[PDB]
Amino acid sequence: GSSGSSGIKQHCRFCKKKYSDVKNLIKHIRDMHDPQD
């Protein structure tokens, strides 16, 4: 196909886990790591 929703999946920079979108990754970061400083 000439176009599609490819490459949208994301990874945690702290614990190297994976998510199919950025918003569930941001919730994971705020719940498990919280890089506030």
What are the start-end ranges of the E strands in the chain?
A: 10-11, 18-19
> Which DSSP category does 10 fall into?
E
Tell me if 12 is assigned to a ligand binding site. yes
Tell me if 8 is assigned to a ligand binding site. no
Backbone angles phi, psi at 9, to 5 degrees: -75, 150
Looking at residues 1 to 37 of the shown chain, list those that interact with Zn ion (rule: CB under 5 A): 12, 14-15
Tell me if 14 is assigned to a ligand binding site. no
Binding-site residues: 12, 15, 28, 33
Give the residue numbers of the binding site for Zn(2+): 12, 15, 28, 33
Binding site for Zn ion (CB under 5 A): 12, 14-15
